[PDB]
Design a protein around this ligand. Structure first.
Ligand code: CLA
Ligand code: CLA
Ligand code: CLA
Ligand code: CLA
Ligand code: CLA
Ligand code: CLA
Ligand code: CLA
Ligand SMILES: CCCCCCCCCCCCCCCC(=O)OC[C@H](COP(=O)(O)OC[C@@H](O)CO)OC(=O)CCCCCCCCCCCCCCC
Ligand SMILES: CC1=C(/C=C/C(C)=C/C=C/C(C)=C/C=C/C=C(C)/C=C/C=C(C)/C=C/C2=C(C)CCCC2(C)C)C(C)(C)CCC1
Ligand SMILES: CC1=C(/C=C/C(C)=C/C=C/C(C)=C/C=C/C=C(C)/C=C/C=C(C)/C=C/C2=C(C)CCCC2(C)C)C(C)(C)CCC1
Ligand SMILES: CC1=C(C/C=C(\C)CCC[C@H](C)CCC[C@H](C)CCCC(C)C)C(=O)c2ccccc2C1=O
Ligand code: SF4
Ligand code: SF4
Lengths: 36, 122, 132, 80, 741, 146, 145
C-alpha cells in the first residue's frame, strides 16, 4: 500500500459514495414525521 | 354529527405569524399523505375505493358524496345557534310555526320584526 | 342532480378523496348553460343542482357567476373523507356582506393601524406586533 | 393560516367582504362608525392572502390588513 | 341578401376632441390626477372594444384605421421611390450591377457624420442600402430615375386617396354592422378581385414590359438604348423580334393552342445564369396560373345568385365521433369577434413572412439579388423577425378573444369547449415534449463541449464521430434533385439549387449551390424544434388558461391584462394571459435569434464565397460550420467572436454607424434589465424622496409622479430588451455582410 | 358516436375515459403487468420488474459508454448497469422508508414497509441477474444462418 | 468596472504598451474591442476542433458561467404565477399516469416563492458573473504571459 494510490481510492468515495449517502440521510431526515 | 370534527385536526397553531384554526379548522383531520396505486385486489389506504379491474385509476373513483338529506341536516345543525338567536330576539313551538310556515332558510333570512309580522297570521 | 356535463381533466384529484372536497348546491328555474370554473360549459338542470369541486374558491367563483343568473339560494359545504359534512356558506343563512345581528366581531384592534407596537419592544416574546 | 385584522378606522362600507374570493370576512354590528357595522374575519383558515380586500378598502391607511403567515393547503390554493 | 348599408354623416369633423386628450375613455376623460393617466392614454388609444360596447362602431373605427395604415404604407413606398429617384446611384448600378454598391440614402455633412457617405461607386457617395430596391426596380423594367419619380408621385397620390377614404368612411359614409358581416362576399372579392385580378394584371405587366426589358438588359443592351415601355405595347414587331410568338398575337390564346406561348411562358426552374435570379418567364407563367386559381377560388361562396357555399353550413357539417359538435359555433365567433379574426390572420401572416424568408433565399426572385449577400441576409432576417412578431400577436389576440368575446352559451360541446375541457392533458404533454427536446437537443451541444474540453474528440456527436445524420432531410433533398426529369417532367431544372446540382456563379460570386445537411444541421434543426415548442407552450398556456385555472378560478373577471392576484396562494405574479404573451415574446426572440444565426453561419460557411473560373470554391468562412457549430464554444469563438470583427473594427470608416449602433443596442438591452428585474414599490418609494425635494422648494406638479404600473414595467422592460438585442444583431449582421459582399 | 366520456360516469373528476385510458388493449396490458397483476407476491413483482429492466439497461452502456471500442466494452457495460441498478435500489429503499415509516407493517399489501422491502429485494436480484443474462447473450450474437 | 479597469491597465503595462490603454480607454468601443475581444483569444481556444491545452478548463468554466448567468435571468424575469399553473398540470399528469402513480410525493410540489425566486435568480446571476470573470482573468493573463 502507498499514499500515491489514495486519489483513485478516495476520489470515488468523496465524490460518489459520500454525496449519495448524505443526500439519502437528508432525505430521510426531512421525510421523518416525528424528529423530536 | 359532531360540529367540531373539522377543528379536531393535528394542526398545532404557532405562537406567531399564524391565524390558527378559525371557524371550521385550519385543515382536514385526515392525513393526505397516503400510498400510491396498488395491484388488482388490493387497497392503497384504509377507505380507498377498489378500482376493480383498473386499480391504476382507483383514485378517480369517488367515495365522498353529499346526499341531499345530509345537506339539509347539516344545514340545520350548523345554523342551530343562529336560529336560537333569532327566536331569542323575535320572542320552541313558535320556532316550529315559523320554520314550517315559511321555511328554515327564509326564517334565517328574515328579521325579528318581520317574523313578528308573519306570526300575526295565526 | 348533477348538471349536464361531459367531463374534463380539470376536476378534482386524489385530495378530494383523502383530504377534503367541496360541494355546491343551488336551485335553477330553467335549463341554462354556465361556465365551469374548471374549464368548459355545463347545462344547469331545472330544479336542484349539485356540483363537486376541489377548492372552496372554485365554489365561490361559481356562486359569483350564479348571482349573474339571479340565483341566490346556493349553499356550499365541505366534505371530509369519513363522510362528515361542514356547512360553509352562507354560514348563518345570510350573506356576509349584509350585516346580521348575532354575529360577533372577530380580529378587531381598537385603534388605527399606526398604533401597533415597535418590533424591538417585543423581541423574544414569540408574538408579532399585529398580535400585541 | 394567514392573519387578517380589522382596525377601528373601518367605515363599514362592506367592500372588503364583497372582494373576498374565499369568504373570510363578514359584516357585524358596531357602534363605532356611522354605518353601524364593522368588518370581521372569523374564517381566516380559508384566507388565501390575495389582498383583494385591502385593494377594496377606501380608508387611509387601510382598515383591513392581511399579514401572511403559516401556509396550509387552503392558504396555498391547492387543488391537489 | 348581400347589400350595402351605410349611415351618412355619422361623425362630425372637428378639432374639439383633439383638445380633450382621453376623450375616448370614460375614466380617462376626467383628466389626469397622476402621471399614470398619461401612460394609460397611450395604452388604451386603439383598444376600441373597451371604448364602446357597440360592435358596429368598433367595425367602423377599424375600417377607417385600416385606411390610415394604407396611407402610411403608400407614403413609405413613395418615399423609397423618391430616394431612388434623387439620392441613389441606380442609373450607374444599372450599367454595372456587379461592381457598384447599391445606395439610396445620403447624409448631410454635419459634425463629421459625412464619413457615412461610403465610396459606393458610380460617382456617388452614400449609405449602402440592403432592402433590395435596385433589384426589384430592374426586375420591373425600371431603367430611368424619371420612372421612379412618377412611381413616387403616384404613391403620394394613393397615400392622399387612402387618407381621404378613411375620413370619408368614418365621418361621411360609415357602413352598418350588417355590411361588415359579409364573410362570403368578402372572401369572393378578396380572392377573385384582390388576389386574382392583382395576379392577372401583374402578369400583364411582366409579359408586356418587364420581360422584354430584362431580356435586352441581360443581352448587354445599354439602359439608354432600350425602347420606352409603351413602345412594346404599340409595336407588336418589337416584341416579335424578342419573343416570336407575339407575331401570332392573341389568336392562340382564344384558339386554345397555348403551347405557342412557350417562348415567354416557361417552366425552366433553376436560375438565370446571367442574373442569378429566377427566369422572368417562369415568374410570369406563375402569376398567370395563380391568377386563374384565385379567380376560381373566388366563386366558391354564395352571395346573391343561389349558387355557392355557405361557410356556416360547411363548418357545421364537419364533426366526428371524437369531437362532439365539431366546428359548430365557429362561424358565429369569426363573424362577431375582431380578436378571433386577428388571431387567425396574424398567425397566418407571420407564418407567411417566415415562408417568404426561406423561399426568397433559396429561389432568389430578383436579378443580382443572390450575390448581394448583404441584401439576402437582411431580407431573410427582417422577414423572420416580422413573422415571429406576427405569430406571437396572433397568440395574444386569441387570448384576448378567450377573455372578452368567448361565451360559454355559444360554445357547448364544440371543438373550443372540448379543448378547454382537456387543457391539463394538452399542457402537460407539451411540457414533457419541451423538456425532452430541450434536454436532448441542447445536451448534444453540452456533451460535445465537455468531450472536446476533456480531449475526447472521438466521443463527440459529429460527422467524424458518433453521427446524427438527418436522413429524412437528405432523402427529401435527393427526391427534389431527381424531380426535374421524372416527377416534374416538364421542368428543365430543379426548383432550387440548394437541393443539389451545379454551382450558380455570378461575377465570380456564388449565387446558390447545394446545401448539404450533416450532424451539425441535425442538431440545429432540433434546437429550432425545441425553441418553437417552448414558445407554443407559453402561448397556448396563455390562451387555454386565460379564463380560469386551478390557481385563480375567476381569471376572466380579472381581465386579459392584470399584473397578478396578490402574493397569496404562494404568489400569483404574471398569471394573466398578457404575461404569457410577455414571456412568449422572450422565447420568440430566442428562437428567431437562433434561426438567423444558423442562416448566417451556414450560408457563409457552405454556400457564399468566390469561385475561380477553373472551379475552385472558396467559402466566406472556409467550411468551418460542420466541426465548429457542434459546440457552444465554436459558436462563441468561430461565429460571434470572429464575425464581430467587422462591427468592432468599423470606427473611422463608412461602417462606423454600425459600431455605434452595436454599442447603443448593447446599452439599451442592458437598460431593459432594470425594468425586468425590479419592481415598482422600490421606485415609488424613491420618487417619494424626490417629490420631497421638489416640495422643499415650493413646487411640485399637480399631476403627481408615479412609478410605472407593474404591467407597464414589464412592457417597457421587454420593449427595450427586444430593441437592444435585435438592434445588436442588426448592426452586427449589416457590418459583416457589407464587408463580405 | 362519442368515444370520450367522463371517467367512472363522474363528470367532475379530473379524468376522461378515452381509447387511450380505457381501451381493451390498455386495460388488458395494465392489468397483466407485474406491478398490477393479481396474485403475485411482492417479491415476485419486484423480480419480474427487475428482470425486465436490467436486460435493456446494459445496451446503452455497452454500445455507447466510454470503453465501447475496447475489447472489454461489454464487461464495462455490465459494470455500469450494475452501478445504475445500485443507484435505483437506493432510491427504492429510501422511498420505502419515507413512504411507509419504520413501524411493523400490519398487512401483506405491496404498499407496506415489509412488502416494499420484499419488492425492492426482488427488483435488485431481477435487475442484476437480467444484466448478467444480457451480458451472456451479447457475448455471442447469432447470425441465424443455416 | 473596478476590476476591468485594474486588469486592462495591468495587461497593457505587462504587454509593454501602456499607450493602448491610454488611448483606447477613453471610449466604450476601446474597452469592448481592445480589452474583452482582444484578450478573449487564448481563453476561447483552450479547446477547439484541433485539440486542447491546459486552459480548456477555463474555457469550459467561461461557458459555464455564461450559462449560469443566463439561467438566473429566467428566475429574475419570469415570476411565480406562470410556474405554479404549469406545475398544476405536472401534478395532474403524474396522478393520471399508470405505473408512475404507484409512487407519490409526500411534499406537494409548488412553484418557488416570490422572494425565493428573487434569491435564486440573484445567486445564479452572481455565480455566473464570478465564474465567467475568474475564468477570463486567469485564462487571458496566463495564456498571454
Ligand atoms: C478543507 C480543505 C481541503 C480541501 C478543499 C481538499 C480537497 C481535496 N483533497 Mg484534501 N486533504 C486535506 C484538506 C482539503 N482537501 C487535509 C487537511 C488532508 C490531510 C488529512 C487532506 C488529505 C488528502 C488526501 C490523501 C487526498 C486528498 C484529496 C483531495 C481532492 C479530492 C477530494 C478527496 O478525495 O479528499 C479526501 C480527503 C480526506 C480523506 C481528508 C479530508 C480532510 C479535510 C480537512 C476535510 C475538510 C472538511 C471541510 C472543511 C468541511 C467544510 C466543507 C463544506 C462546508 C462544503 C480535493 C482537491 C485527494 C487528491 O489529492 O486527489 C488528487 C487525495 O487523494 N486530500
Ligand atoms: C417614407 C418615409 C421617409 C423617411 C424615413 C425619409 C427620410 C429622409 N428624407 Mg425623405 N422623402 C420622403 C419620405 C421619407 N424620407 C417623401 C414621401 C418625399 C417626397 C416629399 C421625400 C423627399 C425628400 C427630399 C427632397 C429630401 C429628403 C431627405 C430625407 C432625409 C432627411 C430628412 C430630414 O431630416 O428633414 C428635415 C426634418 C425636419 C424638418 C423634422 C420636422 C419634424 C416635424 C416638425 C414634426 C412632425 C410631428 C407631427 C407630424 C407634427 C405635430 C405638430 C404639428 C401639428 C405642428 C431623411 C433620410 C433629404 C435628404 O435626403 O438629403 C440628402 C432631402 O433633401 N426626402
Ligand atoms: C413591418 C412590415 C414589413 C416591412 C417594413 C417590410 C419590408 C419589405 N418587404 Mg416585406 N413582407 C411583410 C412585412 C414587411 N415587409 C410580411 C408580413 C410579408 C408576408 C406577406 C412580406 C412579404 C414580402 C414579399 C413577398 C416581398 C417583401 C419585400 C419587402 C422589401 C421591399 C418593400 C416593397 O415595397 O416590396 C413590394 C413587394 C413586392 C414587390 C412583392 C409582393 C409579393 C407578395 C406575395 C404580395 C402579397 C400581397 C397580398 C395582397 C397580401 C395578402 C396575403 C393574402 C394571403 C391575404 C422591404 C424590405 C420585397 C423584397 O424583398 O424586395 C427586394 C418582396 O418581394 N415582403
Ligand atoms: C374586388 C374588390 C375589392 C378589392 C380590390 C378590395 C381590397 C381590399 N380590401 Mg376589401 N372589401 C370588398 C372588396 C374589395 N376589397 C367588399 C365587396 C367588401 C364588403 C364585404 C370589402 C370589405 C373590406 C373590409 C372591412 C376591409 C377591406 C380591406 C381591403 C384591403 C385589404 C388590405 C390589403 O391587403 O390591401 C392591399 C393594398 C392594395 C391592393 C393597394 C390598393 C388599394 C386600392 C384602394 C384597391 C382598389 C383599386 C381598384 C382598382 C378598385 C384591400 C385594399 C381592409 C382594409 O384595409 O380597408 C381599408 C379592411 O379592413 N375590405
Ligand atoms: C394587425 C396587427 C395588430 C393590431 C391591429 C393590434 C391591435 C391591438 N393590440 Mg395587439 N399585438 C400585435 C398586433 C396587433 N395588435 C402583435 C404583433 C403583438 C405581439 C407583440 C401584439 C400583442 C399585444 C398585447 C400584449 C396587447 C395588444 C393590445 C392591442 C389592442 C390595443 C392597442 C393599443 O392601444 O396600443 C397602443 C400602441 C402603442 C402604445 C405603441 C407601442 C409602441 C411599441 C411598444 C414600440 C414601438 C417600437 C418602435 C417601432 C421602434 C422605435 C425605435 C426607436 C425608439 C429607436 C389593439 C386592439 C392590447 C390589448 O389590451 O388588447 C385588447 C394588449 O395588451 N397586442
Ligand atoms: C440559458 C438560460 C436558461 C435555461 C438553461 C432555461 C431552461 C429552461 N427554461 Mg427558461 N427562461 C430563460 C432562460 C433559460 N431557461 C429566461 C431568460 C426566461 C425569461 C424570459 C425564461 C422563461 C421561461 C418560460 C416561460 C419557460 C421556460 C422553460 C425552460 C425549460 C424548458 C424545458 C427544457 O428544455 O428543459 C430541459 C433542460 C434544459 C434544456 C437545460 C439543460 C439541459 C442539460 C444540458 C441536459 C440534461 C442534463 C441533466 C438534467 C443532468 C444534470 C446533471 C446535474 C445533476 C449535475 C428549461 C428548464 C419552460 C418550461 O419549463 O417548459 C417545460 C417554460 O415554459 N423558461
Ligand atoms: C442530454 C443529452 C445527452 C445525450 C443523449 C448524451 C449521450 C451520451 N453521453 Mg453525454 N453528457 C451530457 C448530455 C448527453 N449525453 C451532459 C449534459 C453531460 C455533462 C456535461 C455529458 C457528459 C458525459 C460524459 C463524461 C460521458 C458522456 C457519455 C455519453 C454516451 C454514453 C451515455 C450512456 O451510456 O447513458 C446510458 C443511458 C441510459 C441508461 C438510458 C438512456 C435513455 C433511454 C434509452 C430512454 C428510453 C425511453 C423509451 C424509448 C421510452 C418508451 C419505451 C417503451 C417502454 C414504450 C452517450 C452517447 C459517455 C461517453 O463515453 O460518450 C461517448 C461519457 O463518458 N456524457
Ligand atoms: C408532425 C406534426 C406534429 C405531430 C405531433 C405529434 C405526432 C403524433 C401524431 C399526431 C397526429 C394525429 C393526431 C390524431 C389524429 C387526428 O388527426 O385527428 C383524428 C381525430 C379527429 O376526430 P373526428 O373524426 O371526430 O374529427 C372530426 C373533425 O371534423 C374535427 O371536428 O382527432 C381526435 O381523435 C382527437 C385529436 C387529438 C389527438 C391528440 C393526439 C396527439 C396530438 C399531438 C399534438 C399535435 C401537434 C400538432 C399541433 C398543431
Ligand atoms: C408600383 C406602384 C404603383 C403603381 C402601380 C400600378 C401602375 C398599377 C397598375 C395596375 C394596372 C394597370 C392594372 C390593370 C388591370 C387590368 C385588369 C386586371 C384587367 C382584367 C381584364 C380581364 C378580366 C379580361 C377579361 C376579358 C376577356 C378575357 C375577354 C373578353 C373581354 C374581357 C375584357 C371581359 C403605385 C403608383 C400605386 C405606387 C406604389 C408602387
Ligand atoms: C412488444 C411490443 C412493443 C414493445 C416492445 C418492448 C418494449 C419489449 C421489451 C422487451 C424486454 C425489455 C425484454 C426483456 C427481456 C428480459 C429477459 C430475457 C430476462 C431474462 C433474465 C434472466 C433469465 C436472468 C436470470 C438470472 C437471475 C434472475 C438471477 C441469477 C442470474 C440469472 C442470470 C440466472 C411495442 C411497444 C414496440 C409495440 C409492438 C409490440
Ligand atoms: C426604472 C424603473 C421605474 C422608474 C421609471 C420611470 C418612472 C419612468 C420615467 C419616464 C419619464 C419621466 C418619461 C420620459 C421623460 C424623459 C426621461 C425626461 C423628460 C422630462 C420631461 C420633458 C417630461 C419604474 O417606475 C418601474 C416600475 C415597474 C417596474 C420597473 C420599473 C423601473 O425599472
Ligand atoms: S375594512 Fe375597509 S373595505 Fe372593509 S368594511 Fe372596513 S372600511 Fe370598508
Ligand atoms: S404585487 Fe408584484 S410581487 Fe406582489 S403578487 Fe403582485 S406582481 Fe407579485
Amino acid at each position: 500500500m502507498a499514499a500515491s494510490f489514495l486519489p483513485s481510492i478516495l476520489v470515488p468515495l468523496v465524490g460518489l459514495i459520500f454525496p449519495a449517502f448524505s443526500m439519502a440521510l437528508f432525505f430521510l431526515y426531512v421525510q421523518t414525521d416525528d424528529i423530536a | 354529527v359532531d360540529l367540531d370534527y373539522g377543528m379536531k385536526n393535528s394542526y398545532v397553531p404557532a405562537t406567531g405569524g399564524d391565524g390558527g384554526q378559525g371557524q371550521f379548522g385550519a385543515q382536514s383531520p385526515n392525513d393526505w399523505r397516503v400510498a400510491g396505486t396498488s395491484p388488482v385486489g388490493e387497497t392503497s389506504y384504509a377507505g380507498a375505493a377498489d378500482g376493480g379491474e383498473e386499480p391504476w385509476f382507483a383514485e378517480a373513483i369517488s367515495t365522498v358524496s353529499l346526499d341531499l338529506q345530509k345537506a339539509d341536516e347539516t344545514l340545520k345543525a350548523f345554523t342551530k345557534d343562529a336560529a336560537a338567536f333569532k327566536i331569542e330576539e323575535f320572542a320552541d313551538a313558535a320556532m316550529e310555526e315559523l320554520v314550517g310556515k315559511l321555511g328554515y332558510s327564509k326564517f334565517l333570512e328574515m328579521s325579528t320584526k318581520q317574523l313578528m309580522k308573519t306570526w300575526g297570521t295565526l | 342532480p348533477f348538471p349536464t356535463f361531459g367531463g374534463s381533466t380539470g376536476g378534482w384529484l386524489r385530495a378530494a378523496e383523502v383530504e377534503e372536497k367541496y360541494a355546491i348546491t343551488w336551485t335553477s328555474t330553467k335549463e341554462q348553460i354556465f361556465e365551469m370554473p374548471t374549464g368548459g360549459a355545463a347545462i344547469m338542470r331545472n330544479g336542484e343542482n349539485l356540483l363537486y369541486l376541489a377548492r372552496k374558491e372554485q365554489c365561490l367563483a361559481l356562486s359569483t357567476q350564479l348571482r349573474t343568473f339571479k340565483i341566490n339560494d346556493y349553499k356550499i359545504y365541505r366534505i371530509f373523507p369519513s363522510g362528515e359534512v361542514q356547512y360553509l356558506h352562507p354560514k348563518d343563512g345570510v350573506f356576509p356582506e349584509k350585516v346580521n345581528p348575532g354575529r360577533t366581531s372577530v380580529n378587531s384592534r381598537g385603534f388605527s393601524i399606526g398604533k401597533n407596537p415597535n418590533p424591538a419592544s417585543i423581541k423574544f416574546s414569540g408574538i408579532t406586533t399585529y398580535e400585541s | 393560516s394567514h392573519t387578517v385584522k380589522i382596525y377601528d378606522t373601518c367605515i363599514g362600507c362592506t367592500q372588503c367582504v364583497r372582494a373576498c374570493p374565499t369568504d373570510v370576512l363578514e359584516m357585524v354590528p358596531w357602534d363605532g362608525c356611522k354605518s353601524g357595522q364593522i368588518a370581521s374575519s372569523p374564517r381566516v383558515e380559508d384566507c388565501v392572502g390575495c389582498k383583494r380586500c385591502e385593494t377594496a378598502c377606501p380608508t387611509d391607511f387601510l382598515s383591513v390588513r392581511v399579514y401572511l403567515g403559516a401556509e396550509t393547503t387552503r392558504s396555498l390554493g391547492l387543488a391537489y | 341578401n348581400v347589400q350595402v348599408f351605410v349611415e351618412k354623416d355619422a361623425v362630425e369633423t372637428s378639432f374639439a376632441k383633439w383638445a380633450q386628450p382621453g376623450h375616448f375613455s370614460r375614466t380617462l376623460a376626467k383628466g389626469p390626477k397622476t402621471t399614470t393617466w398619461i401612460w394609460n392614454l397611450h395604452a388604451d388609444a386603439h383598444d376600441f372594444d373597451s371604448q364602446t360596447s357597440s360592435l358596429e362602431e368598433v367595425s367602423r373605427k377599424i375600417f377607417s384605421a385600416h385606411f390610415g395604415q394604407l396611407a402610411i404604407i403608400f407614403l413609405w413606398i413613395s418615399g423609397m421611390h423618391f430616394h431612388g429617384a434623387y439620392f441613389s446611384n441606380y442609373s450607374a448600378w444599372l450599367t454595372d450591377p456587379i461592381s457598384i454598391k447599391q445606395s439610396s440614402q445620403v447624409v448631410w455633412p454635419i459634425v463629421g457624420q459625412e464619413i457615412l457617405n461610403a465610396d459606393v461607386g458610380g460617382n456617388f457617395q452614400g449609405i449602402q442600402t440592403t432592402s433590395g430596391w435596385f433589384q426589384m426596380w430592374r426586375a420591373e423594367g425600371i431603367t430611368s430615375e424619371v420612372e421612379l419619380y412618377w412611381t413616387a408621385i403616384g404613391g403620394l397620390a394613393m397615400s392622399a386617396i387612402m387618407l381621404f377614404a378613411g375620413w370619408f368612411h368614418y365621418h361621411k359614409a360609415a357602413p352598418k354592422l350588417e355590411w361588415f358581416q359579409n364573410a362570403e362576399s368578402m372572401m369572393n372579392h378578396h380572392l377573385a378581385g384582390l388576389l386574382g385580378l392583382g395576379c392577372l394584371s401583374w402578369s400583364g405587366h411582366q409579359i408586356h414590359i418587364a420581360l422584354p426589358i430584362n431580356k435586352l438588359l441581360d443581352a448587354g443592351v445599354s439602359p439608354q438604348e432600350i425602347p420606352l415601355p409603351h413602345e412594346f405595347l404599340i409595336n407588336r414587331d418589337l416584341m416579335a423580334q424578342l419573343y416570336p410568338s407575339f407575331s401570332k398575337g392573341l389568336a392562340p390564346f382564344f384558339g386554345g393552342n397555348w403551347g405557342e406561348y412557350s417562348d415567354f411562358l416557361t417552366f425552366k426552374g433553376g436560375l438565370n445564369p446571367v442574373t442569378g435570379g429566377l427566369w422572368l418567364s417562369d415568374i410570369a407563367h406563375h402569376h398567370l396560373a395563380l391568377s386563374v386559381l384565385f379567380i376560381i377560388a373566388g366563386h366558391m361562396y354564395r352571395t346573391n345568385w343561389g349558387i355557392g357555399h355557405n361557410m356556416k353550413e360547411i363548418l357545421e357539417a364537419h364533426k366526428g365521433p371524437f369531437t362532439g359538435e365539431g366546428h359548430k359555433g365557429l362561424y358565429e365567433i369569426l363573424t362577431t369577434s375582431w380578436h378571433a379574426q386577428l388571431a387567425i390572420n396574424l398567425a397566418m401572416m407571420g407564418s407567411l413572412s417566415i415562408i417568404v424568408a426561406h423561399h426568397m433565399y433559396a429561389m432568389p426572385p430578383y436579378p443580382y439579388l443572390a450575390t448581394d449577400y448583404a441584401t439576402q441576409l437582411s431580407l431573410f432576417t427582417h422577414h423572420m423577425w416580422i413573422g415571429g412578431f406576427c405569430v406571437v400577436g396572433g397568440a395574444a389576440h386569441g387570448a384576448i378573444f378567450m377573455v372578452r368575446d368567448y361565451t360559454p352559451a355559444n360554445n357547448y360541446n364544440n371543438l373550443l369547449d372540448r379543448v378547454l375541457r382537456h387543457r391539463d392533458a394538452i399542457i402537460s404533454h407539451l411540457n414533457w415534449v419541451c423538456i425532452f427536446l430541450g434536454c436532448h437537443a441542447f445536451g448534444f451541444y453540452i456533451h460535445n463541449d465537455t468531450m472536446r474540453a476533456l480531449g475526447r474528440p472521438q466521443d463527440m456527436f459529429s460527422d467524424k464521430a458518433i453521427q446524427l445524420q438527418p436522413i429524412f432531410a437528405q432523402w427529401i433533398q435527393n427526391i427534389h434533385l431527381l424531380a426535374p426529369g421524372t416527377t416534374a417532367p416538364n421542368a428543365l431544372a430543379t426548383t432550387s439549387y440548394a437541393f443539389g446540382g451545379d454551382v450558380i456563379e455570378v461575377g465570380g460570386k456564388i449565387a446558390m449551390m447545394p446545401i448539404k445537411l450533416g450532424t451539425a444541421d441535425f442538431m440545429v434543426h432540433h434546437i429550432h424544434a425545441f425553441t418553437i415548442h417552448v414558445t407554443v407552450l407559453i402561448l397556448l398556456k396563455g390562451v387555454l388558461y386565460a379564463r380560469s385555472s386551478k390557481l385563480i378560478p375567476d381569471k376572466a373577471n380579472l381581465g386579459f391584462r392584470f399584473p397578478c392576484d396578490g402574493p397569496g396562494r404562494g404568489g400569483t405574479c404574471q398569471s394573466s394571459s398578457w404575461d404569457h404573451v410577455f414571456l412568449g415574446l422572450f422565447w420568440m426572440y430566442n428562437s428567431i435569434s437562433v434561426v438567423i444565426f444558423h442562416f448566417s453561419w451556414k450560408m457563409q460557411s457552405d454556400v457564399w464565397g468566390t469561385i475561380t473560373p477553373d472551379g475552385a470554391i472558396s467559402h466566406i468562412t472556409g467550411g468551418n460550420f460542420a466541426q465548429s457549430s457542434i459546440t457552444i464554444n465554436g459558436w462563441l469563438r468561430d461565429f460571434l467572436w470572429s464575425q464581430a470583427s467587422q462591427v468592432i473594427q468599423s470606427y473611422g470608416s463608412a461602417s462606423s454607424a454600425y459600431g455605434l449602433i452595436f454599442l447603443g443596442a448593447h446599452f439599451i438591452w442592458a437598460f431593459s434589465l432594470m425594468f425586468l428585474f425590479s419592481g415598482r414599490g422600490y421606485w415609488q418609494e424613491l420618487i417619494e424622496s424626490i417629490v420631497w425635494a421638489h416640495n422643499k422648494l415650493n413646487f411640485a406638479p399637480t399631476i403627481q409622479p408615479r412609478a410605472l404600473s407593474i404591467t407597464q414595467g414589464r412592457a417597457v422592460g421587454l420593449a427595450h430588451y427586444l430593441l437592444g438585442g435585435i438592434g445588436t444583431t442588426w448592426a452586427f449582421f449589416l457590418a459583416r455582410a457589407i464587408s463580405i459582399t | 358516436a362519442n368515444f370520450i366520456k367522463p371517467y367512472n360516469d363522474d363528470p367532475f373528476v379530473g379524468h376522461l375515459a378515452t381509447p387511450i385510458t380505457s381501451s381493451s388493449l390498455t386495460r388488458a396490458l395494465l392489468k397483466n403487468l407485474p406491478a398490477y397483476r393479481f396474485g403475485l407476491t411482492p417479491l415476485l413483482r419486484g423480480l419480474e420488474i427487475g428482470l425486465a429492466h436490467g436486460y435493456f439497461l446494459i445496451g446503452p452502456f455497452a454500445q455507447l459508454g466510454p470503453l465501447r471500442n475496447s475489447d472489454i466494452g461489454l464487461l464495462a457495460g455490465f459494470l455500469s448497469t450494475i452501478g445504475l441498478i445500485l443507484i435505483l435500489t437506493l432510491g427504492l429503499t429510501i422511498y420505502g422508508a419515507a413512504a411507509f415509516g419504520q413501524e411493523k407493517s400490519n398487512g401483506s399489501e405491496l404498499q407496506t414497509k415489509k412488502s416494499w422491502d420484499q419488492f425492492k429485494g426482488g427488483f435488485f436480484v431481477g435487475a442484476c441477474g437480467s444484466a448478467g443474462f444480457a451480458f451472456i447473450c451479447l457475448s455471442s450474437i447469432p447470425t441465424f444462418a443455416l | 468596472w473596478v476590476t476591468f479597469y485594474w486588469h486592462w491597465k495591468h495587461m497593457t503595462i505587462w504587454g509593454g504598451n501602456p499607450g493602448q490603454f491610454d488611448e483606447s480607454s477613453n471610449y466604450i468601443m476601446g474597452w469592448l474591442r481592445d480589452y474583452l475581444w482582444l484578450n478573449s483569444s487564448p481563453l476561447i481556444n483552450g479547446y477547439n476542433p484541433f485539440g486542447m491545452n491546459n486552459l480548456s478548463v477555463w474555457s469550459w468554466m467561461f461557458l459555464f458561467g455564461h450559462l449560469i448567468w443566463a439561467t438566473g435571468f429566467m428566475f429574475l424575469i419570469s415570476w411565480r404565477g406562470y410556474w405554479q399553473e404549469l406545475i398544476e398540470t405536472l401534478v395532474w399528469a403524474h396522478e393520471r399516469t399508470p405505473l408512475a402513480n404507484l409512487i407519490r410525493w409526500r411534499d406537494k410540489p409548488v412553484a418557488l416563492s416570490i422572494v425565493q425566486a428573487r434569491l435564486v435568480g440573484l445567486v445564479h446571476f452572481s455565480v455566473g458573473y464570478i465564474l465567467t470573470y475568474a475564468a477570463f482573468v486567469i485564462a487571458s493573463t496566463s495564456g498571454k504571459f
